[PDB]
C-alpha cells in the first residue's frame, strides 16, 4: 500500500458523487459555455467560418516578416473589413 | 516486364544493380493472376523475361 | 536537521506518485507539454503560419489537428512569449505558432526530467540504471528530429508538426525530398525497430508455451508467485525447441534480456544520427554509377530511378502547398506527369 | 484544508479534461 | 539604452526567477509541516 | 614504488587524497556561480537567436567592415 | 577474463599506464594531424584562391592553420594569392613537421610511463594504495588552461606577440591574418565579432587562472564529493565527456550558422547565405550603384568581382551534398573556370524576365521565368501539347554582361534554355571537369562535412556521458543487486522516505 | 621489473565470435553498396 | 518485389493508392511494432536492471546465470518495485505470466491488423479520406495537413509507371 | 568486382550459418 | 459519508461507459455534419 485511500472506495463513495456530480456537470458546460459564446475564438485567435478571407481575397495571410509578424497580423486582420 | 508494356527492368546484380538496387521483379502484368510455371513459357528466354522466377520463389 | 535535508525527505517519500528532486523538472515541463498540445489541437490555428485549419474548433477530427510548427520567415527563434516576435501578446503569440517552441522545449526538458526519475527511483530502489539507459534512445531520436533537424534547415517551419497527420506528411516529405528510405541510418533504425518487435513476440510466446504446470487451472495465469524462487518457464525445454526449429536458441537469460534492450535501443540510436545527416541535407539519395549508367542508356531501368521518379512527382506536386513561403506557381505544363494519369 | 501529490496529479488532469470535452462537444454544432 | 528585447529579457528572467521561487518556498514550507518521524 | 627527482618535486600537489571541507562547505557560493553562468549562457543565446537585440549589436556577417 | 569491451578497464587504478595510454593517445592525435596536413599540401592547388579556393578542393585541416595565421608554404606561395612570401619555419609544412615531431616525443613518453607505471608518486602516503588527488589536479589542470587561454588572447590573437587571426569584410572578398583587439562592449557577445573572440579569451582565461587557483586551494565538501563521488577517477570521465559533448555542438552551430571564427574564405559560404540570396543583394546593390554613376550595363557588371559572384552560386551552397557523395566540391560541378557573366533573359516583347532559383531542399527543381512582378512568362514544359509559355512561343533570348560572354546574345532556344537551367543555380560559371573526371554531382564543403561529424559525434558522447554517469553513481550495484535486498525496500508500506531503511 | 598487478585475461567466447561477425558481414553487406555508389 | 529498393516503391504506390497512412489497421500495425520495440527495451532493461549479484567487476553478469538452473535470476518484485513507482504501482505487472502474454499479445495482435490492413486495402477499402474536408463560410477550401498528403500522394500517382496508363482513372 | 563483392559477403554469411549452427558451443546443463 | 462500496461498481462503471459512448458517438455525429463535414 502506498498509504492513500482506494480509489474503487472513493468513486463507489456517495460523498464522491455527491461532490463531483456538481463539479463535473460545471465543468463541462463552462468548456461549453466557452465554444458557444465564441470567446476561445478570441482567447486563441482562431478564425470563425466567415474569417478566413476578405469577401473577393483568395491569399492565405501567411507572416513572411520575423519582428512585425504581430502588426503584420494585426493588419491581416484589419483587411477583413 | 514488370507492367507488361515491354519495359524491362533489371533486378540482378550482373544486370547492373548493388544489394540496395536489386530485387526479384514481379511477373509481368500481361500474366496477371494467370499461373505461369517454367512448362508454360515456350523457352527459359521467355520464362525470365516475363518474371516466371517471380512466381517459382 | 537543516531545510536542505527535510526537503529531501519529502521529496523522497513513498506516496502513490512518487516525486524525487527530478520530480520539480519533470512535472511542469511535462504537463506543459501535454497541456499545450491539448490546447493547441482544441483551440489553435495554424492559417498564418501554413494556411491551414488545425484544430477540433475549426473541425478537423483526431487525425487531423496539431499544433503547427511556426512560418519558415521566424527562422529559429525561441519564440518566448516574451520575445520579441509575440511581445508578450498571448493570441498573437499562439497565431505566430509559439506553442510549438513552447511544447518542443518544455517536453525536451520533461524528457531530461523523465529520465532524471528513471535514475533517482532507480538509485532508491537499489537496481542498476538501465532502464535510464535505455531510454537514452527515445532521447536521441526526439532531439535529433524535432531539434536538431530544423535547426539545421531554414527554420523550425521544417521540424515535424505536433499531430497525426502532420506527421504522416513529414514521412512523405522525407521521402520525396531526402529519399530517406534508402538512407542505411534508417535502414538499421527499420531492422532495430522491427526486431525489437520480433524479439517482443517470440519472447513472450515462448516464455508462455514453455510454463511449468504450477497449479490446477486451465487458466494458467494464477499460478504464479512473485517471490516464487523457481523459473515459471523451462529455459532446457525452450532452447530445444528453437534449436530444433531455428538452428540456433538463447541458452543465457541475462544475455537473451540484454539483448532484448540492445536491438531497439541501438536502432533508433542509428536512425537518429540519419536524421542528423538530413539536418544539412546529407542525404544517402543517389547512388552515382546508377546515374552515369541511366543518364547514358535511355534502356537501364531499376526500382531505384522508378523511386527517384517517385520522389520528383512528390516535391513538384506537394511543394506549393507545402512550402507556402516560396510562393511557388508551377504551371500545368511544367508538372511532371507520366501517361493519361 | 488538506490535498495530497495524488489528489493534485488527479485534478491537474481532470479538470481540464472535463471542461475541453464540453468545448468539444459544443463544437459539433457550429455551421459554416 | 534598454531595448524593447532586453525589458523582455528582463521580464523573463523575472518570471522564472519568481516561478522557481515559489515552488521551492512552497516545497520547503510543506516538508517543514509533513516531516518524517524517527 | 620508485621515487624520482622530478616525483620528490610533485609529491605534495598529490598528497591529500580524500581531504574534505566540513559540511556544505562553499557550495552555497558555487549555486550562485553556477546560477551566474546559466544566466549568461542565456544571454548569448538569445543574442545569437535574435531573441535579445542589443543597439550596437549587429548579429550578422554585416557586423564589421 | 574481461570481455572484449572492457579490456581497458585495467587502467582505473593504475595512474602511470593511464598516463601512458592518454600519451599514446596524443601521439596518435598530433600524428593524424600532422599526415593530415601533408596530405593536403601534396593535393591542395594554390594557383586560385578566387575560384579554385582551399573549400572547394576538400581542404580540412589547412583552413584551420589559416584561421590562425598559417597562411604560407616554404614553397613560396600564400593563400592569399601572393608570391615571394617567407613564412619563416611556420608555413603549412612547418606546422606539419612539428606535429609529426610532437607525435614522436609523445609516443617514446608512453613508453617510458608504461614501463615505469610504479612511482611513488601516485602512491597515497598513508595508505600505500594508487591514488590520484582529483581535486587539486583540476584546480592545477584548470590554471594552466586558464594561463594558456589568456596567453592565447592576450599576445597571439591581439598580435601583440603573435600573428592575430583570419578578418574578412562581411562578403569575404579580401580575408586576410590581422590583429585583433579585444572588444569589451556588449558587440563581443556578437558571434560576427572577432573582438569579442579576443576579449573572451583574455576575460575567461582570467577567470580561469582565479577558479583554479581556488580549486587548487580549497577543498571540496564532504557533501560535494560524496555526492559526486570525487574520490572515483569515473566521475570525471562523466563530466568531461558531457563539458565536451557540449563543446562539439557548439562548434557544429557556428560552424552551421558562421561566426568570427568560421570565416567563408576558410571554410566556404553558409546554406543561409543562399536561402536569403545575400551575395545576390550585394552584387545588385554594386550593380545599381554603378548604373547610377552612369556606367553602362556591360560595365556595371564586369565591376563585380569574379569572387563575388561565384558566392552566388548554389554549387557552393554547404547544404546540396550527399553522404556518399566524397571528396573534393571540385568533383561534383567541376573545377571552376570563369564567370560567364550575368545573364539577362528577355521576351519577345523585350521584358526583362528571371529564373526562379532552387531552393535548397531540391535535387531537381523546374525551369520557369516571371517578371518582376512575378508573373509567370516563360518556362521548359514537360508535356508539350498545352503548352503555353514554351521559350520557342515566348521567343526567350538571353544576354550576358561581365565574364567571358560580355556583350554576347543568344536566340536559338537550345542555348537560351541551357543557360535558364545553369540560372535556377545562380551566378553561371565555366568550369573544368575533365581534370579529376567530375561527374556533375553536388558535394558539400567542409563547412558541411566539418557540421555534421560534430554533431554526430557530440550525439554519441551524449550517450557517453550517461553511460558513465549512471557507471560512476551504481558503482556498488553494476555487478548485481544486493543478493539479500530486503522486500521492505522494494515493496511499498514498508518505509516512509524510499531507500531509507531507518523511516 | 616487477609484473604489474593490473592486468587481466582477455575473453571472446564462440557465440560472442559468431554474433561479431554476424554484425560486421551484415553491416558490410549493408555499407558497401554505398561504398562502391 | 523481392527487394530492398522493390519494397520501397511498392510501399509509395500503396501510400498513392490506398493512402495507407490514413488507414486505423496500418496505424495499429504502427502502434504494434513502435510498441513492440518499446516493450522490449523495457522488460530488458528492467530484467536486467535486477540481477542478482552472482559475479565480480572483471567478469560479465551474464555468468552469472547457468543453462537449466532452477532459479530464477533475477528478482523479479526488486524489477516491479522500480516500475510501479516510475509510473504507479497498478500500470506495472508483478505477474511474470501475465507480463509475457501482454509481450507476446501487443505486436502480434498489431500485426495481425497491419497484415488485414495491406489485405482489405487490396479490395480497394482505403484510408480515411479528408481531402477538402474543411470548408469556409463562403465555400473555400481551408486546408488541414490532411490536404498536404493528397498532394503528396497526387506526385506519386502521376508519377508512377509512367507509360502503363492509356486512361485517366487508375482502377487497378 | 562489384558483384563479386556482393556475393562474396553473403557468401561468407551463409558459411557462418552453418558453423554458427552446427558448430555451436554445445548448451550443457548444470 | 466517504463511505467506499455505497455505490455498486458494476453499475458505476456501465454509466460510465454508455456516458464515454455518447460523448464519442456525438464526435463521430460531428464528422458527417457542421464543421469538417465537407457539406
Ligand atoms: C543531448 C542533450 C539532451 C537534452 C537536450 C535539451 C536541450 C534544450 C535546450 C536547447 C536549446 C537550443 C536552441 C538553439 C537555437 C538556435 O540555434 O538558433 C539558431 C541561431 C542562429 O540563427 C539563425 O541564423 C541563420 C544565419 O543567419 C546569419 O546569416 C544570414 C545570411 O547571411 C544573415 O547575415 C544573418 O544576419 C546572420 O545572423 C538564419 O538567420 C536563421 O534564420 C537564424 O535562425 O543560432 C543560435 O542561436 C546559437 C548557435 C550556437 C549554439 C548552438 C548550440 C545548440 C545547437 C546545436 C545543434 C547545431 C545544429 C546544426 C545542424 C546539425
Ligand atoms: C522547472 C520547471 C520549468 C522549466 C525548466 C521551464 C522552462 C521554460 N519555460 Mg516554462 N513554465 C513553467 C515551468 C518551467 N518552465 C511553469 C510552472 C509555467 C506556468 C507559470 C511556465 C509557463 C511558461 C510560459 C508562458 C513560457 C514558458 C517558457 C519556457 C522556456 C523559456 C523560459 C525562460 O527563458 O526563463 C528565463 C528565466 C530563468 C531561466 C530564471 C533564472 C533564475 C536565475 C537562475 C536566478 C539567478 C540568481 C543569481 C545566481 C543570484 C546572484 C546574486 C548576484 C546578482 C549578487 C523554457 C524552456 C517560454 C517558452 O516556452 O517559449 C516558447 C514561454 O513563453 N514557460
Ligand atoms: C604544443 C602546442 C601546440 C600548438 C601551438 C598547436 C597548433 C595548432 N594545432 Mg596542434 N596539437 C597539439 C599541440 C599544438 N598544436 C597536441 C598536443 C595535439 C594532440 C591532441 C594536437 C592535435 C591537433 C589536431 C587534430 C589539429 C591540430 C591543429 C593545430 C593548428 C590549429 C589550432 C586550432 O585551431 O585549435 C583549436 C583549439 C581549441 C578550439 C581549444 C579548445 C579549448 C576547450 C574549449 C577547453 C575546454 C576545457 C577547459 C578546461 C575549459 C575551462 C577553461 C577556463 C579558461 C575557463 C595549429 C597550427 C589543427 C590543424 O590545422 O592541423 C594541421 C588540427 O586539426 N593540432
Ligand atoms: C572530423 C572528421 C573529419 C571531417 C569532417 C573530414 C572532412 C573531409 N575530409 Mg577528411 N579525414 C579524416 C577526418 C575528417 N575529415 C580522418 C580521420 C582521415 C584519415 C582516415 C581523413 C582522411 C581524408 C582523406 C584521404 C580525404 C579526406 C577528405 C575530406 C573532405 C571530403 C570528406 C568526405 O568525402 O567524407 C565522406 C564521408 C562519408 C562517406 C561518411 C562515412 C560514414 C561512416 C562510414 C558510417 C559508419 C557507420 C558504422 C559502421 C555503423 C556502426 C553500427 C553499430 C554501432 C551497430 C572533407 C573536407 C578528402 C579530400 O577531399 O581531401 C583533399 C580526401 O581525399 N579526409
Ligand atoms: C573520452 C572518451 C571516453 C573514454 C576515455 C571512455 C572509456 C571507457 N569506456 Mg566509454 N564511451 C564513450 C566515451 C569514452 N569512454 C562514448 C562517446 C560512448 C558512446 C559511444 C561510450 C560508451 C561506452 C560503453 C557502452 C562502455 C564504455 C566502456 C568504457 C571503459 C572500457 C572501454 C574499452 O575497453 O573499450 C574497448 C574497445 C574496443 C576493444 C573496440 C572499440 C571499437 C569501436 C567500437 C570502433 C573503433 C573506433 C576507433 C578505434 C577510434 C575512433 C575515435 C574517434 C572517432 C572518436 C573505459 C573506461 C565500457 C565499460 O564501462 O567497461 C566497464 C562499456 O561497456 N563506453
Ligand atoms: C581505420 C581502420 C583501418 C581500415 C579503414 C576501414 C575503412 C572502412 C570504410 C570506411 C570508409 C568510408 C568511406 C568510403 C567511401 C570512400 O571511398 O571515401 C573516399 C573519401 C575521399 O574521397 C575521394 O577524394 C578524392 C580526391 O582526393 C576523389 O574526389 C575521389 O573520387 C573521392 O572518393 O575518403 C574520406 O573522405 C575519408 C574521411 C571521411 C571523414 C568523414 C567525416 C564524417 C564521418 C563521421 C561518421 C560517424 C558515424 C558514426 C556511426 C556510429
Ligand atoms: C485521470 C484523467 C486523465 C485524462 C486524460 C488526459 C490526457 C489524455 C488525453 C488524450 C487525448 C486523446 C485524443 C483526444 C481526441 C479528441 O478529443 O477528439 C475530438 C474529435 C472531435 O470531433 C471533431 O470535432 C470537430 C468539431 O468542429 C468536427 O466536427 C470534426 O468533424 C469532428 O471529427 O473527435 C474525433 O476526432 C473522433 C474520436 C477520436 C478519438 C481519438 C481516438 C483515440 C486515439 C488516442 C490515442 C493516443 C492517446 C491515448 C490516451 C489515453
Ligand atoms: C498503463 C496506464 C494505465 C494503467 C491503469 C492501471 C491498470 C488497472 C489496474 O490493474 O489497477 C487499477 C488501479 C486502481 O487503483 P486502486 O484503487 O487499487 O489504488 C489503491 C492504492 O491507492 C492503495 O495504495 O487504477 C489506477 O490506479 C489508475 C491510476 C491512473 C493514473 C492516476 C494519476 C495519473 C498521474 C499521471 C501519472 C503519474 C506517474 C507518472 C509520472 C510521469
Ligand atoms: C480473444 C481475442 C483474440 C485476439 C487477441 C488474442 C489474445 C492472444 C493473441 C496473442 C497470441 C500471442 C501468441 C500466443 C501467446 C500465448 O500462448 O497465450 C497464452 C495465454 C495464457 O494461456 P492459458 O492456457 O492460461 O489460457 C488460455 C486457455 O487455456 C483458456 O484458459 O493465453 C491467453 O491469455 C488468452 C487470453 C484471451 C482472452 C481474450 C483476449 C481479448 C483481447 C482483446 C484485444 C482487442 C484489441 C483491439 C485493438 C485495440
Ligand atoms: C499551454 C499553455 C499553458 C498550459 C495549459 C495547460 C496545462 C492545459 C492543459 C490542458 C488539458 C490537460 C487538457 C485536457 C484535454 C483532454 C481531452 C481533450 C481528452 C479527450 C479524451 C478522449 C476523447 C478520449 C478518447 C478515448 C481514448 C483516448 C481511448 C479510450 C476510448 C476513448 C475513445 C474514450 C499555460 C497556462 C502554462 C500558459 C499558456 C500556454
Ligand atoms: C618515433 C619518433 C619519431 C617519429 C614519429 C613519427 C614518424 C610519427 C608518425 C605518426 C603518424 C603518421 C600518425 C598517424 C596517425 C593517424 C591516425 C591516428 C588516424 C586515425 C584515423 C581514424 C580514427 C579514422 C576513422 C574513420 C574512418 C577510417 C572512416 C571514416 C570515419 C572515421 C573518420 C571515423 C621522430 C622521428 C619524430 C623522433 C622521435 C621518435
Ligand atoms: C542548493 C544546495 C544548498 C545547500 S546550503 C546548506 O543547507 C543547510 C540546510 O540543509 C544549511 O544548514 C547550511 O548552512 C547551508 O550551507
Ligand atoms: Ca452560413
Ligand atoms: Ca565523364
Ligand atoms: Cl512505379
Ligand atoms: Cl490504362
Ligand atoms: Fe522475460
Ligand atoms: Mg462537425
Known amino acids: 500500500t502506498t498509504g492513500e485511500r482506494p480509489f474503487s472506495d472513493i468513486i463507489t463513495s456517495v460523498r464522491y458523487w455527491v461532490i463531483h456530480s456538481i463539479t463535473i456537470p460545471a465543468l463541462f458546460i463552462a468548456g461549453w459555455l466557452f465554444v458557444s459564446t465564441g470567446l476561445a475564438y478570441d482567447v486563441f485567435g482562431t478564425p470563425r467560418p466567415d474569417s478566413y478571407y476578405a469577401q473577393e481575397q483568395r491569399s492565405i495571410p501567411l507572416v513572411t516578416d520575423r519582428f512585425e509578424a504581430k502588426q503584420q497580423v494585426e493588419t491581416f486582420l484589419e483587411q477583413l473589413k | 516486364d514488370i507492367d507488361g508494356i515491354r519495359e524491362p527492368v533489371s533486378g540482378s546484380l550482373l544486370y547492373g544493380n548493388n544489394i540496395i538496387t536489386g530485387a526479384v521483379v514481379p511477373s509481368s502484368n500481361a500474366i496477371g493472376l494467370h499461373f505461369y510455371p517454367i512448362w508454360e513459357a515456350a523457352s527459359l528466354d521467355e520464362w525470365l523475361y516475363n518474371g516466371g522466377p517471380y512466381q517459382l520463389i | 536537521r537543516g531545510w536542505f535535508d527535510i526537503l529531501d525527505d519529502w521529496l523522497k517519500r513513498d506516496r502513490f506518485v512518487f516525486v524525487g528532486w527530478s520530480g520539480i523538472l519533470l512535472f511542469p515541463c511535462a504537463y506543459l507539454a501535454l497541456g499545450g498540445w491539448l490546447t493547441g489541437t482544441t483551440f489553435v490555428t495554424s492559417w498564418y503560419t501554413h494556411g491551414l485549419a488545425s484544430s477540433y474548433l475549426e473541425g478537423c477530427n483526431f487525425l487531423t489537428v496539431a499544433v503547427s510548427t511556426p512560418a519558415n520567415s521566424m527562422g529559429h527563434s525561441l519564440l518566448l512569449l516574451w520575445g520579441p516576435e509575440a511581445q508578450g501578446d498571448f493570441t498573437r503569440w499562439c497565431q505566430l505558432g509559439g506553442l510549438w517552441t513552447f511544447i518542443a522545449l518544455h517536453g525536451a526538458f520533461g524528457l531530461i526530467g523523465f529520465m532524471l526519475r528513471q535514475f533517482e527511483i532507480a538509485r532508491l530502489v537499489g537496481v542498476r540504471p538501465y532502464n535510464a539507459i535505455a531510454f537514452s534512445a527515445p532521447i536521441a531520436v526526439f532531439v535529433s528530429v524535432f531539434l536538431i533537424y530544423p535547426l539545421g534547415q531554414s527554420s523550425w517551419f521544417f521540424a515535424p508538426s505536433f499531430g497525426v497527420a502532420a506527421i504522416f506528411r513529414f514521412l512523405l516529405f522525407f521521402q520525396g525530398f531526402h529519399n530517406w528510405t534508402l538512407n542505411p541510418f534508417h535502414m538499421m533504425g527499420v531492422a532495430g525497430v522491427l526486431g525489437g518487435a520480433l524479439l517482443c513476440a517470440i519472447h513472450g510466446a515462448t516464455v508462455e508455451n514453455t510454463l511449468f504446470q504450477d497449479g490446477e487451472g486451465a487458466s494458467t495465469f494464477r499460478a504464479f508467485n512473485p517471490t516464487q524462487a523457481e523459473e515459471t518457464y523451462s529455459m532446457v525445454t525452450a532452447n530445444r525447441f528453437w534449436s530444433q526449429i531455428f538452428g540456433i536458441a538463447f541458452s543465457n537469460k541475462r544475455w537473451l534480456h540484454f539483448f532484448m534492450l540492445f536491438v531497439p535501443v541501438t536502432g533508433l540510436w542509428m536512425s537518429a544520427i540519419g536524421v542528423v545527416g538530413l539536418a544539412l541535407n546529407l542525404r544517402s539519395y543517389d547512388f552515382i554509377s546508377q546515374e552515369i549508367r541511366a543518364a547514358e542508356d535511355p534502356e537501364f531501368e531499376t526500382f531505384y530511378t522508378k523511386n527517384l521518379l517517385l520522389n520528383e512527382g512528390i516535391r513538384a506536386w506537394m511543394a506549393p502547398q507545402d512550402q507556402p513561403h516560396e510562393n511557388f506557381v508551377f504551371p500545368e505544363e511544367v508538372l511532371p506527369r507520366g501517361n493519361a494519369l | ?32 | 539604452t534598454i531595448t524593447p528585447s532586453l525589458k523582455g529579457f528582463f521580464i523573463g528572467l523575472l518570471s522564472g526567477a519568481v516561478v522557481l521561487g515559489l515552488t521551492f518556498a512552497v516545497l520547503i514550507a510543506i516538508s517543514q509541516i509533513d516531516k518524517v518521524q524517527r | 614504488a620508485r621515487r624520482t627527482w622530478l616525483g620528490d618535486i610533485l609529491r605534495p600537489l598529490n598528497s591529500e587524497y580524500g581531504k574534505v571541507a566540513p559540511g556544505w562547505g562553499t557550495t552555497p557560493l558555487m549555486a550562485v556561480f553556477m546560477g551566474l553562468f546559466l544566466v549568461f549562457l542565456l544571454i548569448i543565446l538569445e543574442i545569437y537567436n535574435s531573441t535579445l537585440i542589443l543597439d550596437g549589436v549587429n548579429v550578422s556577417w554585416k557586423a564589421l567592415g | 577474463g574481461l570481455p572484449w569491451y572492457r579490456v581497458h578497464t585495467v587502467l582505473i587504478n593504475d595512474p602511470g599506464r593511464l598516463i601512458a595510454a592518454h600519451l599514446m593517445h596524443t601521439a596518435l592525435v598530433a600524428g593524424w594531424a600532422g599526415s593530415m596536413a601533408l596530405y593536403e599540401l601534396a593535393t591542395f592547388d594554390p594557383s586560385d584562391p578566387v575560384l579554385n579556393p582551399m573549400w572547394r578542393q576538400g581542404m580540412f585541416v589547412l583552413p584551420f592553420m589559416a584561421r590562425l595565421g598559417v597562411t604560407g608554404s616554404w614553397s613560396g606561395w600564400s593563400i592569399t594569392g601572393e608570391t615571394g612570401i617567407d613564412p619563416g619555419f611556420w608555413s603549412f609544412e612547418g606546422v606539419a613537421l612539428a606535429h609529426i615531431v610532437l607525435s614522436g616525443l609523445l609516443f617514446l613518453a608512453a613508453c617510458w610511463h608504461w614501463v615505469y607505471w610504479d612511482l611513488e608518486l601516485f602512491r597515497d602516503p598513508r595508505t600505500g594504495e594508487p591514488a590520484l588527488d582529483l581535486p587539486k589536479m583540476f584546480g592545477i589542470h584548470l590554471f594552466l588552461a586558464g594561463l594558456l587561454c589568456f596567453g592565447f588572447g592576450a599576445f597571439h590573437l591581439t598580435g601583440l606577440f603573435g600573428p592575430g587571426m583570419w578578418v574578412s569584410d562581411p562578403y569575404g572578398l579580401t580575408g586576410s591574418v590581422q590583429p585583433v583587439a579585444p572588444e569589451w562592449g556588449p558587440d563581443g557577445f556578437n558571434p560576427y565579432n572577432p573582438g569579442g573572440v579576443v576579449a573572451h579569451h583574455i576575460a575567461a582565461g582570467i577567470v580561469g587562472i582565479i577558479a583554479g587557483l581556488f580549486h587548487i586551494l580549497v577543498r571540496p565538501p564532504q557533501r560535494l564529493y560524496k555526492a559526486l563521488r570525487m574520490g572515483n577517477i569515473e566521475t570525471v570521465l562523466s563530466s568531461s565527456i558531457a563539458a565536451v559533448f557540449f563543446a562539439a555542438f557548439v562548434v557544429a552551430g557556428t560552424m552551421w550558422y558562421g561566426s568570427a571564427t568560421t570565416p567563408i574564405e576558410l571554410f566556404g559560404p553558409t546554406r543561409y547565405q543562399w536561402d536569403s540570396s545575400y551575395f545576390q543583394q550585394e552584387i545588385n546593390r554594386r550593380v545599381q550603384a554603378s548604373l547610377a554613376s552612369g556606367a553602362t550595363l556591360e560595365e556595371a557588371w564586369s565591376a563585380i568581382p569574379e569572387k563575388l559572384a561565384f558566392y552566388d552560386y548554389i554549387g557552393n551552397n554547404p547544404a546540396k551534398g550527399g553522404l556518399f557523395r566524397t571528396g573534393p566540391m571540385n568533383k561534383g560541378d567541376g573545377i571552376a573556370q570563369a564567370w560567364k557573366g550575368h545573364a539577362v533573359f528577355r521576351n519577345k516583347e523585350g521584358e526583362e524576365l528571371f529564373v526562379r532559383r532552387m531552393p535548397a531542399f531540391f535535387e531537381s527543381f523546374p525551369v520557369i521565368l516571371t517578371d518582376k512582378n512575378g508573373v509567370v512568362k516563360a518556362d521548359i514544359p514537360f508535356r508539350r501539347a498545352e503548352s503555353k509559355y514554351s521559350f520557342e512561343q515566348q521567343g526567350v533570348t538571353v544576354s550576358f554582361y561581365g565574364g567571358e560572354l560580355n556583350g554576347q546574345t543568344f536566340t536559338d532556344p537550345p542555348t537560351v534554355k541551357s543557360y535558364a537551367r545553369k540560372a535556377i543555380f545562380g551566378e553561371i560559371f565555366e568550369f573544368d571537369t575533365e581534370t579529376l573526371n567530375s561527374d556533375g554531382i553536388f558535394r558539400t564543403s567542409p563547412r558541411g562535412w566539418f557540421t555534421f561529424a560534430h554533431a554526430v559525434f557530440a550525439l554519441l558522447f551524449f550517450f557517453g556521458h550517461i553511460w558513465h554517469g549512471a557507471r560512476t553513481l551504481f558503482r556498488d550495484v553494476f555487478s548485481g543487486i544486493d543478493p539479500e535486498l530486503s522486500p521492505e525496500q522494494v515493496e511499498w508500506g514498508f518505509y516512509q522516505k524510499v531507500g531509507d531503511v531507518t523511516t | 621489473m616487477e609484473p604489474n598487478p593490473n592486468r587481466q585475461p582477455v575473453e571472446l567466447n564462440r557465440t560472442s565470435l559468431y554474433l561479431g561477425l554476424l554484425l560486421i558481414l551484415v553491416l558490410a553487406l549493408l555499407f558497401s553498396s554505398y561504398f562502391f555508389n | 518485389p523481392l527487394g530492398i529498393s522493390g519494397t520501397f516503391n511498392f510501399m509509395i504506390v500503396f501510400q498513392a493508392e490506398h493512402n495507407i497512412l490514413m488507414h486505423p489497421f496500418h496505424q495499429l500495425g504502427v502502434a504494434g511494432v513502435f510498441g513492440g520495440a518499446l516493450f522490449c527495451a523495457m522488460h530488458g532493461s528492467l530484467v536486467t536492471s535486477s540481477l542478482i549479484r552472482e559475479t565480480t567487476e572483471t567478469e560479465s553478469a551474464n555468468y552469472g546465470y547457468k543453462f537449466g538452473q532452477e532459479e530464477e535470476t533475477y528478482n523479479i518484485v526488486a524489477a516491479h518495485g522500480y516500475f510501479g513507482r516510475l509510473i504507479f504501482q497498478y500500470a506495472s505487472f508483478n505477474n511474470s505470466r501475465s507480463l509475457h502474454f501482454f509481450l507476446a499479445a501487443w505486436p502480434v495482435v498489431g500485426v495481425w491488423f497491419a497484415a488485414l490492413g495491406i489485405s482489405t486495402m487490396a479490395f480497394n477499402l482505403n484510408g480515411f479520406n479528408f481531402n477538402h474536408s474543411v470548408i469556409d463560410a463562403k465555400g473555400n477550401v481551408i486546408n488541414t495537413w490532411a490536404d498536404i498528403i493528397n498532394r503528396a500522394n497526387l506526385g506519386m500517382e502521376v508519377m508512377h509507371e509512367r507509360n502503363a496508363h492509356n486512361f485517366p482513372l487508375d482502377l487497378a | 568486382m562489384e558483384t563479386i563483392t556482393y556475393v562474396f559477403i553473403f557468401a561468407c554469411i551463409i558459411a557462418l550459418f552453418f558453423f554458427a549452427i552446427f558448430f555451436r558451443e554445445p548448451p550443457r546443463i548444470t | 459519508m466517504s463511505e467506499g462500496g455505497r455505490i455498486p461498481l458494476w453499475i458505476v462503471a456501465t454509466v460510465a461507459g454508455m456516458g464515454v459512448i455518447v460523448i464519442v458517438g456525438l464526435f463521430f455525429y460531428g464528422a458527417y455534419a457542421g464543421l469538417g463535414s465537407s457539406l
Open chain 4, 1 to 32: 484544508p488538506i490535498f495530497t501529490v495524488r489528489w493534485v496529479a488527479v485534478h491537474t488532469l481532470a479538470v481540464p479534461t472535463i471542461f475541453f470535452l464540453g468545448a468539444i462537444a459544443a463544437m459539433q454544432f457550429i455551421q459554416r
